[PDB]
Structures are given as structure tokens and as C-alpha cells.
Structure 1
Amino acid sequence: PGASAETVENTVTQIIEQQMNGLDGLRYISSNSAGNGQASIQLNFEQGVDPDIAQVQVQNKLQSATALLPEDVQRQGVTVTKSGASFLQVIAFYSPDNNLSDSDIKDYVNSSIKEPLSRVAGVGEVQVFGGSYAMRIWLDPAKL
């Protein structure tokens, strides 16, 4: 948080990448650094590699790599996931007669439908378009 894309590339992505070199069946590494302080490393493996073994070996190298990061980065915590960007299905939720409001639909999807479907057999990841309810405190600087 707070760093420029160039600082991110210099201090996070390059060191994680340098540690990630040397994995068993690796094909190519694609990476990006964003001005909002976010780093992304994508590891593509060769055909016929076990995905679970790939994940655990990434974690085994990342364990030691994490000590070489800035402390601000270590505080947020770095995460390891395996998935494919494409989508199998998209479901839509809507009100045909407008009885139910958009915020009601969105909160209901987030509260009642997302978690059970993401535990369905064979589903890898679930992306949601629409937010759930939250308590917002909107401050006025002048009054503060």
C-alpha cells in the first residue's frame, strides 16, 4: 500500500520471481506491477504436471521468499491460488416485475447463494458482480 508501480516491481515482483525460478516443470512466468500497490505473478507449468504438487512447491519456495520482502508487504500477506481465467457459466439475478430492489437482490445473492454454489462439486472459483450490505460512515472534514 502506497507504493508506485516501479517500487513494486523493484521490491516485490522481481524478488518473488527470482525465488520462483527453479521449479520442476515450469513453462513461463507472466507478471505485472500496478500503481495501486499490487503485484501479480502467474506461473504456467508444463503439460503433465500435477497441479497440487505445483501448488505445494510454489508454497515451499514462497515460504523463504517472503522474508526478503518489505515489512509493509509482509503485513498484508501474500496469497497462492491456482485457477483459470476463463468462465464456465454466468448466472444472472434480476427482478422481472421490480418487486425486489437491486440492493436486495445483490445482498441476497451474496448472503444465500454464493457460498453454497462455491462448495458445489467441481467448482473452482466464484466471482460476484454486485455487493452485499455494509455500514458506511461518511465523514465531513470540516466538522471533524
Structure 2
Amino acid sequence: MFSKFFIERPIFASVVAIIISIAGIIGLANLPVEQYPSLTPPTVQVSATYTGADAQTIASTVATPIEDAINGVDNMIYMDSTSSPGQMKLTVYFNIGTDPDQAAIDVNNRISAATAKLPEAVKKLGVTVRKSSSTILEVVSVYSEDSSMNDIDIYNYVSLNILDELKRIPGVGDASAIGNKNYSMRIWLEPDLLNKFG
């Protein structure tokens, strides 16, 4: 009998238990730890910026070409686009069980062909394609307890210094700040002076 073989041989059963234990400890040390697995179907986000353009203008001129080009990508269930003043946001949903990187590279290749149609400003700022399947590990807030640093100063300090160190950390997929206030040489025209000097 199968069980009789182990009953008569306690050392064999013990070493089988020890080997199982060692394999289990190795696996436990090497098991990935997450909050939830990839339950949600994979998604790819496409973003284009047309500064100063209305929602209708963006929808017709930026949203329509990119959406038409992305249409037909393999393993795509449905595709959604939201156009707001200045920005176009497109989210492509893929059938669950599709590799996010394959989907992202497919959408990238399609938009590469579609880019030249887009208005000049959209092409100049570029079209951003990324996978949004990743979930948030955590949120870190850098704040100025005093009024010494504005939103601009904190954001640029974070982007130049904090973000680079955090991205180097093992296991950090990426760190992105939300303020969206980069440094920029702002030239503030004064129409009275412009008219005075012709």
C-alpha cells in the first residue's frame, strides 16, 4: 500500500516534509505581494494636448482621427474618448487576458501613423500613450507647512529632486506628480503697451 510505505519509513516521510517545507519557504520569500491582482481588464490611455482649443474643436480634429486609427486594434472590446478644453483623453479597453504591453505597443504603432494628420500644435506637444492597468501602491504628499514655497516651487522641487530618487527605488514602477505646473518662461503681454508702441 502507498500509505504503508510511509508509515513503515518515518525518516522518508520526514525528509519529504522537510523538502516540502524548504520549497515552501523559498516560494514564500519569493512570492510577489500585492493588494489585488489584475482583476480589471487592461486599459490603454491616449492623451493629446491642443492648448486653447474648445471641446468640440478637439473632439472633431484630434479625437476623431486618433480614435479612427486606434479602431481595429486586436483584442479591443470598446474604446472611449473624453474631450475637454485643451486636452483630449482617450481610453481603450481590451479583452481581459490581453498583455498590457502588447496592447500599448499596438496603439502606439497605430497613433504613429495617425499623428501627421493631427493639427500642428498637437503634433508639437506630442501624443502620449501609456497603460493604466497598474494600480496605486500609495500616495505621497509634499507640502509646505509655511507659505515659503508656492504650488509651482513645490511641484518643480518634487519633479527635479524627489521623483528621481523614488523612481530608483526597487519595485517602484513609476512616480508621477499631479500638480501639472512645470517651470515656464511666461511672457505677459500688455495690450495697452502693445498698442502704444505699434
Instruction: Compute the TM-score of the two structures, normalised by the length of structure 2.
Output: 0.57
Following superposition, the deviation at residue 129 of structure 1 comes to: 5.5
Counterpart position of 2:60: 10
User: Which residue type is aligned with residue 115 of structure 1?
Assistant: D
3-state DSSP of counterpart to 2:89: strand
Name the counterpart of 1:50. 99
Q: Displacement, 1:101?
A: 4.4
CA distance change for structure 1 residues 24 and 76 in 2, over 3 Å: closer, same or farther?
same
Cα distance, 1:122 vs structure 2: 3.3
Conserved 8 A contact 1:118-1:126: yes
Q: Alpha-carbon deviations, 1:98-124, whole Å to 9, x = none? A: 6x9445x93654443221112333333
Distance 2:182 2:129 in 1: 28
The structure with the greater share of residues assigned to strand is 1
Q: 2:69, 2:114 within 8 Å by CA — same for their partners in 1?
A: yes
Size of the aligned set, in residue pairs, is 140
- In structure 2, the partner of 1:124 is 173
Is the CA contact 1:5–1:33 (under 8 Å) kept in the aligned structure 2?
A: yes
CA distance 1:72–1:102, change in 2 (3 Å) = closer
In the alignment, what sits opposite 2:73?
23
CA 137–34 in structure 1, closer or farther in 2 if over 3 Å, else same = closer
Provide the secondary structure at the position in 1 that maps to 2:129: coil
Structure 1 range deviating more: 7-16 or 74-83:
74-83
Could you list the runs of 5+ residues in structure 2 that have no partner in the other structure? 1-50
> 1-side partners of 2:67 and 2:184: how far apart?
39
Q: Of Structure 1 and Structure 2, which has the larger fraction of its residues in helix?
A: 2
Match of 1:34 among 77, 84, 90: 84
1:115 aligns with 2:164: yes
C-alpha distance 131-48 of structure 1, shift in aligned 2 (>3 A): closer
Higher relative contact order, structure no. (Cα contacts within 8 Å, ≥ 6 residues apart): 2
Alignment of 1:84-103 (within 5 A): 84=133, 87-93=136-142, 101-102=148-149
Which SS does the other structure have where 2:169 is aligned?
coil
Q: Structure 1 residues 130 and 40 mapped into 2: Cα distance closer, same or farther (>3 Å)?
A: closer
User: Does the 8 Å CA contact 1:83/1:125 hold for their aligned counterparts?
Assistant: no
Q: Does 1:80 align with 2:129?
A: yes
Q: 1:90 to 1:22 in 2, by over 3 A?
A: same
Give the 3 Å change call, closer, same or farther, for CA 24–124 of structure 1 in structure 2. Answer: same
CA distance in 1, matches of 2:184, 2:113: 39
RMSD over aligned Cα, in angstroms? Answer: 3.2
Aligned partner of 2:114 in structure 1 is 65
Unaligned runs of 5+ in 1: none
